[PDB]
Paper text:
It has a double-ring structure, and each ring consists of eight paralogous subunits (denoted as CCT1–CCT8) arranged in a specific order. Each TRiC subunit consists of three domains: the substrate-recognition apical domain (A domain) and the ATP-binding equatorial domain (E domain) linked by the intermediate domain (I domain). Here, we present an ensemble of cryo-EM structures of endogenous human TRiC throughout its ATPase cycle, with three of them revealing endogenously engaged tubulin in different folding stages.
Two cryo-EM maps, including an open-state TRiC with an empty chamber (61.6% of the population), and another open-state TRiC but displaying an extra density in one chamber (38.4% of the population), were determined to resolutions of 3.1 Å and 4.1 Å, respectively. We then denoted the empty chamber open TRiC map as TRiC-NPP. The NPP state is equivalent to the “apo” state, the starting point in the conformational cycle of the chaperonin itself. Our TRiC-NPP map displayed a conformation similar to that of the available substrate-free open-state human TRiC map, with a determined subunit assignment. We then built an atomic model for TRiC-NPP. Further inspection of the TRiC-NPP structure revealed the characteristic V476-K484 insertion in the E domain of CCT1, corroborating our subunit assignment for this map.
Residue numbers in the entry:
A (entry chain H): 6 to 233
B (entry chain d): 24 to 154
C (entry chain a): 418 to 533
D (entry chain Q): 7 to 529
E (entry chain E): 18 to 203
F (entry chain d): 463 to 539
G (entry chain H): 312 to 524
H (entry chain a): 5 to 139
The structure:
């Protein structure tokens, strides 16, 4: 009759942490195969039956909206990494679930959670110090122009792809499109449009805005196409 | 098609029993073959990887599966080696026959065809051998 | 001591054997982990303290790094067994590792059971 | 079929028989209340993934927020929760002291009742030990606040209260709250937490926060006016939008030209409405909801400073300070109900413009801490540290007496009370000794939350106290279960925090022990 | 939200389940391939009744609620604008490649590795087709054989009664809107 | 593929690699379990007589042909 | 006419005008400007475009190919190619990608954990093994054998390797620094910090509370 | 297949032999060292032989399982050869199986595990011999 909970579901101790560790691995499995350029795609269907195919880890987590409490922590952390950077959400999501998996058997053996936190806070700072000590600055290495090194980095992602035979042309289109912008660079600014048919090398790079122009109404031999 | 009479169920019954004997003895092939645990009815237990000893201590009851056991004895008398390789080859051919029979090929056509591969097979091994 | 050496030796071979030699290294720690539990002490800390004094012996041979440090059960602290006189025969640790390895090999090869 | 339930005749309530120990059951409801907050005790307290009634996720370790969200239905637990609410009066800390200590008194009382000691004799021992504890607690006073109004002094003592609410960032928060508290202590005999307000703004991190005078509001000034010294501030709850007439006011429009005529008539009316604001000698206006586009230019026409306060608590905050009350009509020229202020201006701090109500002409005894954080849940948890931190020094305006923390007083006060029970003959010694062991639960909470064998902490804390080394507490460290001096480290607790906590905790425990049967009723 | 009753299946059990759906769409159309193909009786939502063997019409009416099967239909929507004829050949070949892939998943091949293998073989096939190709109207604009070849394919449909008159009409139309020299017909 | 599996190798890539070495080379290419990988078996001196491989295909195929010819089994008494 | 709103709004930010629905408010306030406009003949169809706009912080890249999957697969790879070039110019300090830095930290933390007596030894080592997942899944997703690569990769770092990592193209290890497979060091630093801070929030939690609603 | 017995294959057979050897180790795990705890031995009649010696336990320990009997036959080899270290053998062998069984779940073949453990024992005996102290 007189109980304390009366609907208030609550559990504490080691079983709660282990339950959250397993729930976090589910979010990892949802974005485990999408790591890298050649990662497997993921098909997502909304309520209306509309399909969504994408191998981007950030876009996948936005569409899931998992209701588990522990899973929301990773999603909000990964979402913040997407807003601040736009890349690395999968690495953050996988490492977090993997830090939780490796300390899982020690948590079951009676190791306190707070001792585990001192290790991550300690190992993290040592890792961040090792990155800066071993990292290398590359601005004018080998007296090569930046337009050439950036071409190598561009074709690297495009290597052994469907445009591998003509990636020299496509590699220059990336460096050209980025160099056209001002100091404030952003991915959304540089748009892309698709035109079926024709050779791969015929891909054009308009400096301004471009569109198909399906307008085929009357008006020819008038309406001068050039304006100052 | 109706396929009222189903005598093919006995082929799949003999192939499954024949393939079962091969699937067990498969892992024990070679020097690095995984050992197997045999337990006598009295209570004794033993460990071995010799495929010949495992087939004898299997107590095979199916007729088709017994043909693989008697087949392995024929290899021991004739050659004395490759006892385990024979049962593995027969199990895979019958497993391959399960795909051909589903396509509507008769066992007699499959039987006569395998003899032609055996005839050409012996020529392949004999040509590449070292006298 | 073998927990650090075999873990470093595993990185030299590879070829689907780096993990097995590493797990062989981690498996030996059960002995100091079990002796610590029986001595009413924190096994996670004492096992970690042994591997630290033994790992420092591998980094450099300088005398500041302690060497051949054992485990004292009463005081619940590592101690140099050369001074404490906690010695064992060599054939014990050699045969026990050999016989234990042959036993796990004999069981790992068992992938099936047939009853009659 | 007989024999049915025994001692069940009042609405069929669950009446525990003599074998079922009805008193033992009300205690178990209080022990479960402690376990929900025993882990959140100390600087290494564990956070609680609290789910609000609005299905909102919040991760916090504050005791008052846990109980406010945890619907405690058992009455035996409500009494201890009522002591926590009474703990908030006269002091703003020591809440978990009431939960952990009272839970130990009741948990240890079961060991006495199981032996056969009467509940009325257990109460007499706790009342005697509580009276004895109040005599020993002044003798444990190590230091006392100099009252020099020094930020170096106020920030140093404030570090202990900030920790266990927001650990790690106790340096920044101690300096900021010290700068806010020191600026009001000159107002002798009038310090209160209501003056030191808090304004959270989405920002980079906690390090980007600062203190500013006057009632700061995060919403920048919508109008084009930079500064205005007008006293009359007109507050309206109704937003600037299309007017509606309280009478019939039937508006019929058929043609398109008539639509434009009525539209022009509304703009001419709104131009007269904002004209009335300046006619009443008020160049400032506040709005709750949206603000219209044409009315915005009218605010810049007469140079009327436009102000937007979407939060309701922000509006009521001004109603009780300047006096400007919100009226239901849209711009009624009611000059009588307007406010009074010495200075109103905009200021950019941390790359964000915020409205300010500074008191330049008047002396000024109001401040505000502008917190910055990249998460709303994080700033809210930091706000709870400000209340528990500011209220710590609202108590120091009273008798300035500090005692050691980290479980140091709990062992010495237990050691002094245990000796009193050993030499006191009779049956009261059993409950007096257990009153001392109840204090040991607090060091046991700090040790368990830090990952340390609690029995080893009690063994060491008693040895150093046996040698007379008072002011020794638990050294918060994962890999070091030893102890250290709380005086040298600077960890200090408040006297009145322990006084009112030991008092209210004992009354809550005694009030639960005095109850032996819960009975339903009907009006 | 709505995590309850959420679909959850992955690994080989999911790929084989996806392959099982594509095979049903292929086996349904494998019989309707060619002039001797078996027709399909389609009943419309309005109660109508129609019978045909057109691969495109079969897929448009086939409202398969499985998502993997919908992609097979979206593929054929584009094929009608490029190939026109072998709409059943695409679906029948896809079902064959997925059926043979199921034998590879048991051997332990990854799906992405099979994807790379078929892409390599598809290039070998496309390279071989040009070798065994032949021209018709090379270096000359002619209308006689252009009427002949198009007339053969039309003989399978209901235009067989007057198939010859349709082929001459399809030539003058394309010849009118487009020029055989530019070779860019719209 | 069974020998490669027992030797810790990949059953597919081992026979898939050897089928290319046999198209280009000879029968010397085979699995060497002593070293744990593909090697030239002619150099390792790991050989068997011809009768083992010939009698295996001969007797195994005759058993498969015999089992294939079984239409049904009759229980006598 | 018949211009998509995205292209119009892309030209809005490029020209600096405003898309006004009704034609009654059209005036100089909403009208845009440009330097050179010309109608071209890309692939036979006409493509309008304003070049040298006042707020010309945008552009467009028209793709060509034999099908949509040639362009869609090309569309995915170019968007990251823009980010790679966008990253190298911003941050000059970089580290080897493909999990090369993750294996170096695994060597440093693991060798450091041995010198740390206490319970932190097993945990800092556990932190090191957790970094293996980044080069591991790149091998598993690429269809390679993670065992043969990770063992061959972890062995190279011990002998002196610091930039060797996973090569998604060839099933072998490669010097990702010499191969110009780079990533920003500060972006990788923020990944470890957000990872540990995210794991610490879950590890520091011990109980969940739920108001009945 | 029809037979006059029973068969059971798969990875679970390794796990069943792993959990069996792990069980036999836990019977002599807490009794390791000179401060080892005593343990009862309820015979079939009802006698109770209380002792902490690991060798005396395994001689009297009767667990009708094949994998456990392998470790019992293993105990006789160590007792006759040396006469000590039998308890550490059963405990070391149990952890190698519990760890190897985890590798088998990571698609590591037992032959690759058997090869690693053989080389580790060889190098371990080398490092031991290089770090002795003569009598």
């Amino acid at each position: 009759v007189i109980l304390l909970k009366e609907g208030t579901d609550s559990s504490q101790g080691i079983p709660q942490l282990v339950s959250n560790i397993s729930a976090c691995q589910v979010i990892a499995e949802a974005v485990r195969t999408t790591l890298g350029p050649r990662g497997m795609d993921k098909l997502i269907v909304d309520g209306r039956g509309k399909a969504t195919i994408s191998n981007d880890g950030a876009t996948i987590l936005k569409l899931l909206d998992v209701v588990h409490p522990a899973a929301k922590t990773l999603v909000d952390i990964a979402k913040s990494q997407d807003a601040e950077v736009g890349d690395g959400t999968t690495s953050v999501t996988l490492l977090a679930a993997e830090f939780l998996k490796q300390v899982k058997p020690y948590v079951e053996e009676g190791l306190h959670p707070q001792i585990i936190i001192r290790a991550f806070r300690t190992a993290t700072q040592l890792a961040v110090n090792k990155i800066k000590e071993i990292a290398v600055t590359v601005k004018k290495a080998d007296k090569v122009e930046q337009r050439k090194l950036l071409e190598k980095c561009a074709m690297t992602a495009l290597s052994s792809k469907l445009i591998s035979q003509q990636k020299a042309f496509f590699a220059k289109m990336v460096v050209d499109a980025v160099m056209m912008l001002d100091d404030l660079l952003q991915l959304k600014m540089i748009g892309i449009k698709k035109v079926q048919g024709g050779a791969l090398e015929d891909s054009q790079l308009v400096a301004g805005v471009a569109f198909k122009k399906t307008f085929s109404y009357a008006g020819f031999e008038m309406q001068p196409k050039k304006y100052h | 098609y109706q396929d009222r009479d189903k005598p093919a169920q006995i082929r799949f019954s003999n192939i499954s029993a024949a393939k079962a004997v091969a699937d067990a003895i498969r892992t024990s092939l070679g020097p690095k073959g995984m050992d197997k645990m045999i337990q006598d009815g009295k209570g004794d237990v033993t460990i071995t990887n010799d495929g010949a000893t495992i087939l004898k201590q299997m107590q095979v009851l199916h007729p088709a599966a017994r043909m693989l056991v008697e087949l392995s004895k024929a290899q021991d008398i004739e050659a004395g080696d490759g006892t385990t390789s024979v049962v593995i080859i027969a199990g895979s051919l019958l497993d391959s026959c399960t795909k051909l029979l589903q396509k509507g090929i008769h066992p007699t056509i499959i039987s006569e065809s395998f003899q032609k591969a055996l005839e050409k097979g012996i020529e392949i091994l004999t040509d590449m051998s070292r006298p | 001591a073998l927990s650090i050496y075999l873990e470093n030796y595993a990185t030299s071979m590879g070829s689907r054997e780096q993990l097995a030699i590493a797990e062989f290294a981690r498996s030996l720690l059960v002995i100091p982990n079990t002796l610590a539990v029986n001595a009413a002490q924190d096994s996670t800390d004492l096992v970690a303290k042994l591997r630290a004094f033994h790992n420092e012996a591998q980094v450099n041979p300088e005398r500041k790094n302690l060497k051949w440090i054992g485990l004292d059960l009463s005081n619940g602290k590592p101690r140099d067994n050369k001074q404490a006189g906690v010695f064992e025969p060599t054939i014990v640790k050699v045969k026990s590792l050999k016989f234990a390895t042959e036993a796990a090999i004999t069981i790992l090869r068992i992938d099936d059971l047939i009853k009659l | 079929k007989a024999p049915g339930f025994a001692q069940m005749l009042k609405e069929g309530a669950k009446h525990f028989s003599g074998l079922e120990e009805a008193v033992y059951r009300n205690i178990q409801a209080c022990k479960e209340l402690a376990q929900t907050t025993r882990t959140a005790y100390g600087p290494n307290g564990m956070n609680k993934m609290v789910i609000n009634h609005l299905e909102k996720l919040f991760v916090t370790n504050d005791a008052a927020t846990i109980l406010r969200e945890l619907e405690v239905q058992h009455p035996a637990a409500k009494m201890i929760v009522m002591a926590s609410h009474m703990q908030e009066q006269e002091v703003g800390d020591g809440t978990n002291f009431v939960l952990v200590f009272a839970g130990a008194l009741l948990e240890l009382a079961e060991e006495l009742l199981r032996i056969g000691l009467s509940v009325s004799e257990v109460i007499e021992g706790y009342e005697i030990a509580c009276r004895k504890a109040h005599e020993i607690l002044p003798n444990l006073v190590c230091c006392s606040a100099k009252n020099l109004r020094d930020i170096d002094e106020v920030s140093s003592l404030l570090r202990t209260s900030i920790m266990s609410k927001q650990y790690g960032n106790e340096v920044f928060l101690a300096k900021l709250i010290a700068q806010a508290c020191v600026s009001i202590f000159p107002d002798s005999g009038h310090f209160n937490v209501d003056n030191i307000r808090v304004c959270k703004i989405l920002g980079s991190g906690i390090s980007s926060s600062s203190v500013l005078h006057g009632m700061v509001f995060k919403k920048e000034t919508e109008g084009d006016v930079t500064s205005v010294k007008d006293a009359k501030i007109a507050v309206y709850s109704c937003p600037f939008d299309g007017m509606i007439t309280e009478t019939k006011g039937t508006v019929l429009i058929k043609t398109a030209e008539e639509l434009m005529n009525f539209s022009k008539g509304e703009e001419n009316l709104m131009d007269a409405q904002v004209k009335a604001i300046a006619d009443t000698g008020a160049n400032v206006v506040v709005t709750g909801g949206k603000v219209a586009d044409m009315a915005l230019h009218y605010a810049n026409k007469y140079n009327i400073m436009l102000v937007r306060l979407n939060s309701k608590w922000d509006l009521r905050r001004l109603c009780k300070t300047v006096g400007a009350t919100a009226l239901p009509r849209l711009t009624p020229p009611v000059l009588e109900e307007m406010g009074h202020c010495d200075s109103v201006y905009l200021s950019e701090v941390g790359d964000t413009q915020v409205v300010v109500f500074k008191h330049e002409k008047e002396d000024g005894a109001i401040s505000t801490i502008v917190l910055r954080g990249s998460t709303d849940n994080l700033m809210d948890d930091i706000e709870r540290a400000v209340d528990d931190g500011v209220n710590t020094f609202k108590v120091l305006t009273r008798d300035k007496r500090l005692v050691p923390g980290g479980g140091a007083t709990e062992i010495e006060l237990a050691k002094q009370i245990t000796s009193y029970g050993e030499t006191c003959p009779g049956l009261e010694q059993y409950a007096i000794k257990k009153f001392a062991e109840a204090f040991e639960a607090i060091p046991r909470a700090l040790a368990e939350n830090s990952g340390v064998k609690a029995n080893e902490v009690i063994s060491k804390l008693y040895a150093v106290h046996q040698e007379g080394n008072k002011n020794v507490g638990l050294d918060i460290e994962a890999e070091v279960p030893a102890v250290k001096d709380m005086l040298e480290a600077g960890i200090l607790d408040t006297y009145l925090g322990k006084y009112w906590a030991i008092k209210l905790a004992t009354n809550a425990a005694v009030t639960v022990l005095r109850v032996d049967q819960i009975i339903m009723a009907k009006p | 939200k709505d995590q309850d009753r959420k679909s959850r299946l992955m690994g080989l059990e999911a790929l084989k389940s996806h392959i099982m759906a594509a095979k049903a769409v292929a086996n349904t159309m494998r019989t309707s391939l060619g002039p001797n193909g078996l027709d399909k009786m389609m009943v419309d939502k309005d109660g109508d009744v129609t019978v045909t063997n057109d691969g495109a019409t079969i897929l448009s009416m086939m409202d398969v609620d499985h998502q993997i099967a919908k992609l097979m239909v979206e593929l054929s929507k584009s094929q009608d604008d490029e190939i026109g004829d072998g709409t059943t050949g695409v679906v029948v070949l896809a079902g064959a490649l997925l059926e043979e892939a199921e034998q590879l998943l048991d051997r332990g091949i990854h799906p992405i590795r099979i994807a790379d293998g078929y892409e390599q073989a598809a290039r070998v096939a496309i390279e071989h087709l040009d070798k065994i190709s032949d021209s018709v109207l090379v270096d000359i604009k002619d209308t006689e054989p252009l009427i002949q070849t198009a007339k053969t394919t039309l003989g399978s449909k209901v235009v067989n009664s007057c198939h010859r008159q349709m082929a001459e009409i399809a030539v003058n139309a394309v010849l009118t809107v487009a020029d055989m020299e530019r070779r860019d017909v719209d | 593929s069974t020998l490669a599996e027992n030797a810790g190798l990949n059953p597919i890539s081992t026979v898939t690699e050897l089928r290319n070495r046999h198209a280009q080379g000879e029968k010397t290419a085979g699995i060497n379990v002593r070293k744990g990988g593909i090697s030239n078996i002619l150099e390792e001196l790991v050989v068997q007589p011809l009768l083992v491989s010939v009698s295996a295909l001969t007797l195994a195929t005759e058993t498969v042909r015999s089992i294939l010819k079984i239409d049904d089994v009759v229980n006598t008494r | 006419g018949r211009v998509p709103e995205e292209d119009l709004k892309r030209t809005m930010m490029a020209c600096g005008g405003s898309i006004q629905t009704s034609v009654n408010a059209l005036s100089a306030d909403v009208l845009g400007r440009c330097q050179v406009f010309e109608e071209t003949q890309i692939g036979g169809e006409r493509y309008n475009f304003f070049t040298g706009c006042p707020k010309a912080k945008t552009c467009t890249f028209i793709l060509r190919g034999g099908a949509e999957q040639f362009m869609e697969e090309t569309e995915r790879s170019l968007h990251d190619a823009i980010m790679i070039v966008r990253r190298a110019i911003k941050n000059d300090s970089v580290v080897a990608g493909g999990g090369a830095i993750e294996m170096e930290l695994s060597k440093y933390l693991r060798d450091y954990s041995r010198t740390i007596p206490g319970k932190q030894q097993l945990l800092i080592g556990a932190y090191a093994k957790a970094l293996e997942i980044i080069p591991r899944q790149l091998c598993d997703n690429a269809g390679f054998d993670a065992t043969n690569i990770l063992n061959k990769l972890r062995a190279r770092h011990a002998q002196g390797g610091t930039w060797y990592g996973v090569d998604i193209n060839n099933e072998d290890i490669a010097d990702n620094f010499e191969a110009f497979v780079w990533e920003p060091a500060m972006v990788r630093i923020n990944a470890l910090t957000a990872a540990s801070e995210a794991a610490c929030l879950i590890v520091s939690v011990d109980e969940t509370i739920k108001n009945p609603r | 297949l029809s037979v006059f017995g029973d068969r059971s294959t798969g990875e679970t057979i390794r796990s069943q032999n792993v959990m069996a050897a792990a069980s036999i180790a836990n019977i002599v795990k807490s009794s390791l060292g000179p401060v080892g705890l005593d343990k009862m031995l309820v015979d079939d009649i009802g006698d109770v032989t209380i002792t902490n010696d690991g060798a005396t336990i395994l001689k009297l320990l009767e667990v009708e399982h094949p994998a456990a009997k392998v470790l019992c036959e293993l105990a006789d080899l160590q007792d006759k050869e040396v006469g000590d270290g039998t308890t550490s053998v059963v405990i070391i062998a149990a952890e190698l199986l519990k760890n190897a069984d985890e590798l088998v779940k990571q698609k590591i073949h037992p032959t690759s595990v058997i090869s690693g453990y053989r080389l580790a024992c060889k190098e371990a005996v080398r490092y031991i011999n290089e770090n002795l102290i003569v009598n």
